[PDB]
Amino acid sequence: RVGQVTGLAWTEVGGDLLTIETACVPGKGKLTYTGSLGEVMQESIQAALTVVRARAEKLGINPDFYEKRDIHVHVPEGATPKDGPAAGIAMCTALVSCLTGNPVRADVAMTGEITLRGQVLPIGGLKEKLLAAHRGGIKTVLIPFENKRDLEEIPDNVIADLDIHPVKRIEEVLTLALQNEPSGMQVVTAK
Amino acid sequence: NRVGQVTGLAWTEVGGDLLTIETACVPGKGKLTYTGSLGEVMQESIQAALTVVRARAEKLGINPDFYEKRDIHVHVPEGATPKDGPAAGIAMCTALVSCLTGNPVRADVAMTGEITLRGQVLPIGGLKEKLLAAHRGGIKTVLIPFENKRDLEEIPDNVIADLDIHPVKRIEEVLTLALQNE
Amino acid sequence: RVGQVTGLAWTEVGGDLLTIETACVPGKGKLTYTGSLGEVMQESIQAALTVVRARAEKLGINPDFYEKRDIHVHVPEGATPKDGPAAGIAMCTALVSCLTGNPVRADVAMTGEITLRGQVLPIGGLKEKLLAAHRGGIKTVLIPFENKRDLEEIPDNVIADLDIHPVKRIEEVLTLALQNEP
Amino acid sequence: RVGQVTGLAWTEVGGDLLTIETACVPGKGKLTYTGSLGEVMQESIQAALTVVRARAEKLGINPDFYEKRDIHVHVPEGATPKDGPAAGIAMCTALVSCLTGNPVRADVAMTGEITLRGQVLPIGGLKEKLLAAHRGGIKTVLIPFENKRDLEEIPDNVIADLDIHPVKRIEEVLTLALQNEP
Amino acid sequence: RVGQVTGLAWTEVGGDLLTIETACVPGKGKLTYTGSLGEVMQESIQAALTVVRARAEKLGINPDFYEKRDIHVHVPEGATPKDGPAAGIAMCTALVSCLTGNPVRADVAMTGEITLRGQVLPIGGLKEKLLAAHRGGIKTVLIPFENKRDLEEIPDNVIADLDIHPVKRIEEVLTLALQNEP
Amino acid sequence: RVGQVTGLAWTEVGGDLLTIETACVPGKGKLTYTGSLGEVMQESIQAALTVVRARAEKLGINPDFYEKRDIHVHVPEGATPKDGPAAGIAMCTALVSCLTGNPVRADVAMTGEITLRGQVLPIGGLKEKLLAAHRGGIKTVLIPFENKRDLEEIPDNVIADLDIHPVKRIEEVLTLALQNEP
């Protein structure tokens, strides 16, 4: 569905998968985030939104339109403490979706810290995060290009059930996770 | 008369029981206020509840830009009782709808459950005492999270008999079921 | 401006007689409250204003009074800590009075927790509260309908001197407390 | 001394005299309070300001100053902690003088809690306050009418050179402290 | 665009030579202050501005400048805790110098607490402040007039090398500290 | 490449090679900074911003960008704590680059406290700072002029490797770090 993304980050309850939720209603341009989130995860949300605001042009998001919307990012399991930077790209994917009405591919999950430059930084506890995705029955799990080496210590079986896609840019995260090509118009050529 | 009210079942420092969720929606400028010795999780569930309504304003027959000149005060009575949790979520959501549409809530219904921005109802803990409270309170029908159905076998024989429980999964049900004209 | 009401609420030195003052001066819609007020008493002031807000028209008050009015609620004995919800109905009576010019009766005191729906809720320490009103020469006291059971424990002489009215809703409170129409 | 008043209010190093300062410069209506002020003393300033606002009309003050002027209340001895409500009437006097250009009389000091209704309430530690007025070279001292009984246990010599005026209302204070016709 | 004054005040390292900076670029009138400042020192900044604002035109400063200007006061060595009211006269001197373009002399250092009326109040730790100005090779030092006796405790070799000016009011410091006569 | 500057500052773990990021998208003048930054570092960002504002026209920047843009300064490693004023010049640089579009040299690292006057103050832990730049792969490192003495206590192996540029003012920092000419 739109605005809904499955992230993998640390939670009081160990640190499994997250059901990040966002809503883009008519407002003044205010940003709200809830779900028993720690400071680090909160700042990851603020960064994620700047990454979207600073790419609104190629994302189709109109600046005027934006200043007329209130954004609320909620991470259900409201009583569950959650923290860390790992939901970075998921937060960014959820916002893009919300402001563009573009659905989030099903059975897709993602983990990784996002920078302002759009870079996807490696996270910790990939093992736990993949096992959580496994048990959740997820299909496609996007991970930071820099955690590739961590896969090695992950049970082949688990690895067998996951369609792991290492990324390094949020541009890739968006293309894989979203349905409608998030960036620019499609040009078709022929040899 | 610009204020909805719905009986909810949520956690209180004096055992999670029966509460009257109140919501006023008066001439303002888009200000959200919430009182009632509310814990943080409960405070946040009030924010989730309001967003759900704002995302379906037109869908529910409410001015899509109603929030521009409308102030909203969410209070949960007996202001001295320390209370918390996401279980009053759907109740807060219903109250908001009632306040904004002028559509009255059935006084003989009670509800408990965590609400999601997508409108789904999540399961809650301490289901026994919640219903036990609705029973002691004299509630005819109670809405509960579909996921809490397995929770009903641990519910006392007389209360499950005394009460008309209706497991729900979404907020659409809750609203048609709880509103007097919906 | 500056409407006054004798409320009976909890102060650091137990239940006591309080003089609630409310200033409603020309402004921008800011609510200020002072007098060493605890968090719960602060929330009852907020609940009390949201109640006249939601009922401004029926009270003959301009529906957009808050848009250009500033409210200062001050409870004298500035150093004395106070808290609790028992002053709610009196805050609502003070606000109503300030905004409509209708003066508050003398020899009248009230105690009761206010809800957004306008229902008056039972408070505690009624004995200590009524003794205070008695020692202060109060003629008429307003208590919540559900505090009638607590009357049995009050000395007969105190009961005999005081003209006690158990009220259910805020409308009764204003009718009995305001010396004019409302 | 326009906007400068000598108030007798508690401080960490004792209940001596304080020189209240006020600046009401053109701005957008923001009120600043400084001088290591306690919460209670800070609220006494808000109380006093409201009093002036409610009577701006009768006090020859543009009852629209609230949004056109910036007010800064400072109490020198910057690092010295100060608190309590005993400086309330001095704050009000200080403010009125600032908004009207009406200077305050020399050799005058005042102590007393202020209410929004303009009533002057009794204060504590009178013995130390008046002692600080003596050494301060103060001629006239205004005190809460209800601190009159305190004058008894006060040394003859201290009283001796003091023109103590126990007042009941803020009007008495303005007329007694200000130089020009209030 | 940026005023700079060498003041003397208390730092985590003790009374030291401080460079008080002040930017006054275009804005809407927001006051910002940084440099690990304690509350007392922050309040002295607020007091120092109000003084300039209150003497705007006399100081040759376009009144209503605070309507189109932003002010940021920063005291370098951002990691070093700093506090006290002793840099007040210097804060006022950096502002005046910032808003008028009148340069401040580098061979001048000052210490003193500033009141709204413009009086300079005595400060503490005169010894370590003056010992610091000497080490830093400062030739002229402004100290509060009430601090003169204190000089008798500081060693004569240090004081003999310093051209010290005790000051009672802010005009004096602006006259002695500002390169070009204001 | 623009809005990204390599800096050397204190960090809990130890990797002093920080990558300061800045976004200056269209907004209404909102200042925000994240990355687990301590207070001194947050303030250093504040002084850096004011430095830019002061030299706006000189840098060819619109003198009213502060009200037409939203500034977000992030320092990747969201979880890693960072503090100190040593990233001040990196902040100013990243900031100037963002508002002008002028790319930043990827081979230049910098450390140093910045002041409003634009001067670069010495910093601490220079050995660890440079060692970080060494391994990290930086070829040019800008440092405070006054830190020149600290080099002698750092192995030749590392410094012989670096193109150390001691600086006194922000101008030389900008001309040296920005790709083009400020």
From Swiss-Prot, chain A:
The record's note on what follows loss of this gene reads:
When both lon and ycgE are disrupted levels of OmpF decrease, leading to lower drug susceptibility, with a greater effect at 26 degrees than at 37 degrees Celsius. The mechanism is not yet understood. Decreased persister cell formation upon antibiotic challenge due probably due to increased levels of MazF toxin.
Induction profile = By accumulation of abnormal proteins, such as at high temperatures. Under stress conditions.
Name where it's found.
Answer: Cytoplasm
Source superkingdom: Bacteria
Spell out the catalytic residues.
86, 129
User: Which parts of the sequence belong to the Lon proteolytic domain?
Assistant: 1-180
Give any extra note attached to this record: Both its proteolytic and protein-activated ATPase activities are stimulated by DNA, especially single-stranded DNA.
Its family remark reads:
Belongs to the peptidase S16 family.
Quaternary structure per UniProt? Homohexamer. Organized in a ring with a central cavity. ATP binding and hydrolysis do not affect the oligomeric state of the enzyme.
User: What is known about what this protein does?
Assistant: ATP-dependent serine protease that mediates the selective degradation of mutant and abnormal proteins as well as certain short-lived regulatory proteins, including some antitoxins. Required for cellular homeostasis and for survival from DNA damage and developmental changes induced by stress. Degrades polypeptides processively to yield small peptide fragments that are 5 to 10 amino acids long. Binds to DNA in a double-stranded, site-specific manner.
Name the UniProt record assigns to this protein: Lon protease
**Taxonomic path:** Bacteria, Pseudomonadati, Pseudomonadota, Gammaproteobacteria, Enterobacterales
Q: Gene name? A: lon
| Full-protein residues shown | 594 to 784 of 784
